[PDB]
Amino acid sequence: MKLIKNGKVLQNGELQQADILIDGKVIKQIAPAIEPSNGVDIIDAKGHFVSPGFVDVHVHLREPGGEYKETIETGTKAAARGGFTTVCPMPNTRPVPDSVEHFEALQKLIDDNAQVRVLPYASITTRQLGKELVDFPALVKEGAFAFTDDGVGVQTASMMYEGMIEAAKVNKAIVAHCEDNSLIYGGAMHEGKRSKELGIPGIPNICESVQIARDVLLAEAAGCHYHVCHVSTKESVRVIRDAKRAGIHVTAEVTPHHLLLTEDDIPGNNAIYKMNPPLRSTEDREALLEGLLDGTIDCIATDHAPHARDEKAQPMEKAPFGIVGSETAFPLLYTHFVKNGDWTLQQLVDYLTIKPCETFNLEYGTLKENGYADLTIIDLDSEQEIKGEDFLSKADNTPFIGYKVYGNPILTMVEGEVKFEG
């Protein structure tokens, strides 16, 4: 047994004093006060805010295949430091989780290494080559969270359609990185003012939106739950809004960097600012923010995308796409929108807990009695500077280094086991 003394919890739209008694994997009670019994491990929260653990539906753990970038150990250690207790890693690994053999090998690595709950995505097709559908019921039975189009995969509407029919059969989401291959044009950032100023090839908004517009109609015909990954363009948001209005089961996520930065924030040819989808225009960001606020975009997800230092030191035209984000997500968003803007702590917490869970019909995201002891303790009032030295991730490829932030996690617990202590 464990007891978290002195924390504050959210009730409606206010912080309130409450102690939390934990029995094994579950929490036994949440009470104004509670005296300890026998063999009680003590955690003193010291007045800090106690939140349900964050849930990240889009991370890259890199292992297997890319262990030098990140491992399941380092990646979930980074998640816990960011206050996340559940993450769902993408399938763009080697081997791809596209078979029972590969899923079982992965679950073993998770059992041995994961420091938080890991709900892995399956690919939609064998090796993500987009030529042959995986065995959907077989992967669901091995713990597949969703079936996901990441990388250069599904290349015809027919394959996406057939993939969606299979996911509808197993009551699982098709999750898609919307990117039309012929419309990438070798681009490395948003096609707009800045790409022209820097002489760097850009990616047009249409690369993303046209796939969303196709998939929502394929989803509607298949009767399946379609989820759009990290939305970046103003037109994508429109298409999702129109699709939801038509009664289609589409949901969508936005990343912290797309809420906070635009093409204008890119100081020069710097791959630290290179991710996919790219940081787009002020008009695009305004659309995303509007869409998250009116519910068109369901939740926030990080697209934590660790890469090695020498890789991200190269010019944008050569460097891989991606920035890390598990450790910086909440503090950045809390400081910008809550401490320094209109959002409430409750509103921010919901985008990271209950909303991801409602989207995928998950049981987590709440701080309730009988729920798992999935918690993070966060220091709301002290300022910390974001430094690569502090990252538990193996990587430090992020434009947020140097930012001064409030709302920093100091302790994360997964099923009653302290998994991070700052």
Query: By the criterion CB under 5 A, which residues form the site for Zn ion?
Result: 303
Position 85 contacts Cl ion (CB under 5 A): yes
The item of Ca ion, Cl ion, Zn ion, none sharing an interface with residue 303, based on CB under 5 to 8 Å by kind, is Zn ion
Residue 58 assigned ligand-binding role? yes
Indicate the residue among 94 and 309 with the shorter CB distance to Cl ion.
94
Identify the bridge partners of residue 14 per DSSP, sorted by sequence position: 11
The three-class DSSP label of residue 250 is strand
Q: Which two tokens stand for residue 99?
A: 């078979």
Residue 190 assigned ligand-binding role? no
User: Out of 49, 226, 391, 420, which residue is the one contacting Ca ion (CB under 5 A)?
Assistant: 391
Indicate the residue type of 417: E
Applying CB under 5 A, the site for Cl ion has a residue count of: 10
Position 153 contacts Cl ion (CB under 5 A): yes
Residue 94 assigned ligand-binding role? no
Least distance (Å) between residue 366 CB and Cl ion: 9
The three-class DSSP label of residue 283 is helix
Residue 302's alpha-carbon distances to 191, 218, 393, in angstroms, are: 23, 26, 14
Residue 195's alpha-carbon distances to 174, 267, 292, 398, in angstroms, are: 32, 11, 27, 20
Closest CA to 87 of 123, 38, 121, 132: 121
Residue 258 assigned ligand-binding role? no
Contact 330, 54 (CB under 8 A): yes
Residue 280 assigned ligand-binding role? no
The item of Ca ion, Zn ion, Cl ion, none sharing an interface with residue 391, based on CB under 5 to 8 Å by kind, is Ca ion
Whether 303 is a known active-site residue: answer yes
What is the secondary structure of 311-343 as a DSSP string?
HHTS-TTTSPP----TTTHHHHHIIIIIITSS-
Residue 276 assigned ligand-binding role? yes
Q: Which two tokens stand for residue 374?
A: 């999935």
Residue 153's alpha-carbon distances to 18, 96, 250, in angstroms, are: 49, 12, 20
Q: How far apart are the C-alpha atoms of 44 and 60, rounded to whole Å? A: 33
Position 84 contacts Cl ion (CB under 5 A): no
User: Out of 125, 205, 281, 376, which residue is the one contacting Cl ion (CB under 5 A)?
Assistant: 125
Position 364 contacts Cl ion (CB under 5 A): yes
Least distance (Å) between residue 130 CB and Cl ion: 6
Indicate the residue type of 209: S
How many whole angstroms from its chain centre is CA 268?
27
Tell me which residues in 191-220 interact with Ca ion (CB under 5 A). 199
Closest CA to 334 of 414, 407, 257, 258: 407
Least distance (Å) between residue 301 CB and Zn ion: 9
Phi first, then psi, for residue 36 (nearest 5°) are: -75, 165
Position 186 contacts Ca ion (CB under 5 A): no
Of the candidate spans 15-23, 86-94, 237-245, 334-342, the one that interacts with Cl ion by CB under 5 A turns out to be: 86-94
Position 93 contacts Cl ion (CB under 5 A): no
Determine which one of 298, 303, 374, 379 is catalytic. Answer: 303
Residue 102 assigned ligand-binding role? no
Helical ranges in 171-249 per DSSP H: 193-198, 206-222, 234-245
Position 86 contacts Cl ion (CB under 5 A): yes
Indicate the residue among 153 and 187 with the shorter CB distance to Ca ion.
187
Q: Which positions lie near Ca ion, rule CB under 5 A?
A: 199, 391
Q: Annotated binding site: which residue ranges?
A: 58, 60-62, 92, 150, 177, 230, 276, 303, 307, 321-322
Which residues are near Cl ion by CB under 5 A? 53, 85-86, 123-125, 128, 153, 364, 374
Catalytic residues: 303
Q: Provide the annotated binding site for substrate.
A: 60-62, 92, 276, 307, 321-322
